[PDB]
């Protein structure tokens, strides 16, 4: 019964910079015997399953690059990263093995870029669908930072509510931005009962709110 | 050359039982004990339980032991898992997990996951449509385009284009839940508005619960 705690739960960071999380644990990790310190830290990058950077608390695992350094002995560790890449995005977790495994709540890393405005499409209901009496709109809002992005639907000047669901992306691995996916559905009788249709976005790298629209 | 192999996607139905495996190939089994990691959506790790090939010994996480059993197979170095009375809290992402008994458990090479998803429901494939690429699908010479794959249960389904030939660009989203209950997503890519003329764009997708399989063409 070890409670493995780390902070931040969270933070953000520029390339270059260098980063430090700790993962303080109720219970000491160190024996006596050993004088080796019983703590893993794992990577876990966005829909990948967890790579082990550290044991033994200071030991980097085979081809983990030399900006992880573990750190740390008895009941207080710190993982730091000097040159943090774009590529370091992530979930790390501290995980403690002097008795049964527990994990700590993870640190999330997110990554600081400048304000990147993002590209806006739009797209019809295919045949193929409103073939079956659905018909499902889409707002496809690529590559912008922060996350932080409005998008409202309007039909025929008449702004909906209710009738949308967005879907964002993790951060990009190279750009470090975000994609966002804004589908409208209603029925093909709703379809056809209209003209325009848009999709206005507001966002931080747009001075003047970005319409995209198409006509049925 | 160390892999480890998991089973796929499982629909099991509130109360049954289900039994996910593990083949791991590319080191000597039985001097590496085995571990199962569950991980809820958004949420963090949590062990479960492991075991070593050498007898099946286990050792289990004590909130686990009621829910998880597991066994083992040298034979086939392949380890299994087995989750009984399923409610909804069992619904999650379980790795394999290998470690060495001889040191702890620091767990040096995972599985690659396993979605469990515990419904009432049956499964259903998704009705993949094509996203179109137009004129106001452009900015600055360059066109986006898609496949939505709209109405499965559960998840998840997996998308690829070109079989795996292409990965420029490619924005894959996480599913959303409508309002009728079944998944959603899209899966775009940004592409020039030359290529299209004289360029092929196919959307893989597999959802496998329902073994479900389509190669929609996505055309302007």
């Known amino acids: 019964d070890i409670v493995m705690s780390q902070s931040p739960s969270s933070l953000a960071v520029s390339v270059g910079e260098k980063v430090t999380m700790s993962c303080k644990s109720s219970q000491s990790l160190l024996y006596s015997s050993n004088q080796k310190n019983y703590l893993a830290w794992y990577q876990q990058k966005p829909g990948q399953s967890p790579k082990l950077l550290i044991y033994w608390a200071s030991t980097r695992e085979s081809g983990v690059p030399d900006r992880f350094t573990g750190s740390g002995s008895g009941t207080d560790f710190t993982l730091t990263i000097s040159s943090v890449k774009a590529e370091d995005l992530a979930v790390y977790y501290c995980?403690?093995?002097?008795?049964?495994?527990?994990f700590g709540a993870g640190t999330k890393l997110e990554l600081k870029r400048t304000v990147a405005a993002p590209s806006v499409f739009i797209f019809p209901p295919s045949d193929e669908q409103l073939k079956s009496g659905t018909a499902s709109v889409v707002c496809l809002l690529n590559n912008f930072y922060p996350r932080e992005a409005k998008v409202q639907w309007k039909v025929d000047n008449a702004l909906q509510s209710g009738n949308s669901q967005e879907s964002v992306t993790e951060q990009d691995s190279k750009d470090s931005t975000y994609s966002l996916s804004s589908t409208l559905t209603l029925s093909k009788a709703d379809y056809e009962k209209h003209k325009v249709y848009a999709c206005e976005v507001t966002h931080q790298g747009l001075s003047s709110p970005v319409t995209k629209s198409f006509n049925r | 050359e160390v892999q480890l192999q998991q089973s796929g996607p499982e629909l099991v139905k509130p109360g049954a039982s289900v039994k996910i495996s593990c083949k791991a190939s590319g080191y000597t089994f039985t001097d590496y004990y085995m571990n199962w990691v569950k991980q809820s959506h958004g949420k963090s790790l949590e062990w479960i339980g492991g075991?070593?090939?050498?007898?099946?010994?286990?050792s289990y996480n004590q909130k686990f032991k009621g829910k998880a059993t597991l066994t083992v197979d040298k034979s086939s170095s392949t380890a299994y898992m087995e989750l009984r009375s399923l409610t909804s809290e069992d619904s999650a992402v379980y790795y394999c997990?290998?470690?060495?008994?001889?040191?702890?458990?620091?767990?040096?090479?995972w599985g690659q996951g396993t979605s469990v998803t515990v419904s009432s429901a049956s499964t259903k494939g998704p009705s993949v449509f094509p996203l179109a690429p137009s004129s106001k699908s452009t900015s600055g010479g360059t066109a986006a385009l898609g496949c939505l794959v709209k109405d499965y249960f559960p998840e998840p389904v997996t998308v690829s284009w070109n079989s795996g030939a292409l990965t420029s660009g490619v924005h894959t989203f996480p599913a959303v839940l409508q309002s009728s209950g079944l998944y959603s997503l899209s899966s775009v890519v940004t592409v020039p508005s030359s290529s299209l003329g004289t360029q092929t764009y196919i959307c893989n997708v597999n959802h496998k619960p329902s073994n479900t399989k389509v190669d929609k063409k996505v055309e302007p």
């Open positions: 075991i070593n090939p050498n007898n099946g010994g286990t």
């Open positions: 995980q403690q093995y002097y008795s049964y495994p527990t």
């Open positions: 997990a290998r470690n060495d008994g001889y040191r702890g458990y620091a767990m040096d090479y």
